[PDB]
């Protein structure tokens, strides 16, 4: 099992990140993450713990929405909401900040199902 980008993006964010962090990343189509970026992402998500769910998703959504807009994909608010409601917030944030290519491919899966309409 060599994942393609597309089959990898079909997994939940938490599992993509688990695979990325496993020593056994034998051939995964992911770049090596920048540790300072990873720490900044985890500190940001740490700062959301304890807040109302809407506020956590608004705060991550602000950044995720901007990221999806840079992909050139229409319907970015609806895609952002769907991702915030279907993915682990921390892992989703790591896709956003460290694994942009698999995030765009995950977004393409969503566009193919009409979830941006």
């Amino acid at each position: 099992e060599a994942y393609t980008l597309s089959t990898l993006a079909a997994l939940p964010a938490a599992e993509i990140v688990r695979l990325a962090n496993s020593q056994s990343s034998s051939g995964l189509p992911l770049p090596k993450a920048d540790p300072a970026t990873v720490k900044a992402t985890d500190d940001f998500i740490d700062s959301l713990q304890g807040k109302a769910a809407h506020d956590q998703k608004q705060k991550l959504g602000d950044q995720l929405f901007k990221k999806i807009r840079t992909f050139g994909v229409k319907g970015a608010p609806k895609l952002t909401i769907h991702l915030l409601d279907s993915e682990d917030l921390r892992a989703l944030a790591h896709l956003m900040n460290s694994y942009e290519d698999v995030l765009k491919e995950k977004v393409q899966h969503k566009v193919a199902a009409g979830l941006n309409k």
Partner: peptide, 9 residues
């Protein structure tokens, strides 16, 4: 406020 989440640009 954050009822759905709101992203303006």
């Amino acid at each position: 406020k954050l009822k759905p989440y709101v992203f303006d640009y």
